[PDB]
Amino acid sequence: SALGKLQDVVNHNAQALNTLVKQLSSKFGAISSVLNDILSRLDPPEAEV
Amino acid sequence: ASVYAWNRKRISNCVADYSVLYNFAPFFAFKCYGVSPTKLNDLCFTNVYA
Numbered sequence: 001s002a003l004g005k006l007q008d009v010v011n012h013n014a015q016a017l018n019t020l021v022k023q024l025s026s027k028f029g030a031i032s033s034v035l036n037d038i039l040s041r042l043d044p045p046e047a048e049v
Numbered sequence: 050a051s052v053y054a055w056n057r058k059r060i061s062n063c064v065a066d067y068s069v070l071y072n073f074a075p076f077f078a079f080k081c082y083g084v085s086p087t088k089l090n091d092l093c094f095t096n097v098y099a
Contacts, residue, residue: 031083041092043085 060097066090 027033038047050056067089070076079086 041084041088043088046085 058099060099065094065097 025033030038032038067086081089084092
């Protein structure tokens with residue numbers, strides 16, 4: 001582990017992007033996480049909220 | 050049936066068409082949770098109880 005610092009920079013950036021991609025799966029309270037279903041099985045007035 | 054002995058039924062393996070319901074009555078109550086009634090006629094469901 002002589003090159004620990006450079007490797008650490010790389011891993012931090014990779015981990016940041018990874019968590020950013022994973023957070024797409026959370027629902028945040030909506031009935032579903034994917035936009036297509038929300039826009040498919042609901043009328044526009046309720047789909048707004 | 051009377052409410053304390055309500056009557057369940059299962060519905061599967063059919064082509065469900067929800068466009069016959071509207072011709073029944075002025076429908077004093079018609080509300081849907083989680084789905085809209087007009088966008089009902091294009092979805093696929095797992096198991097349907099009545």
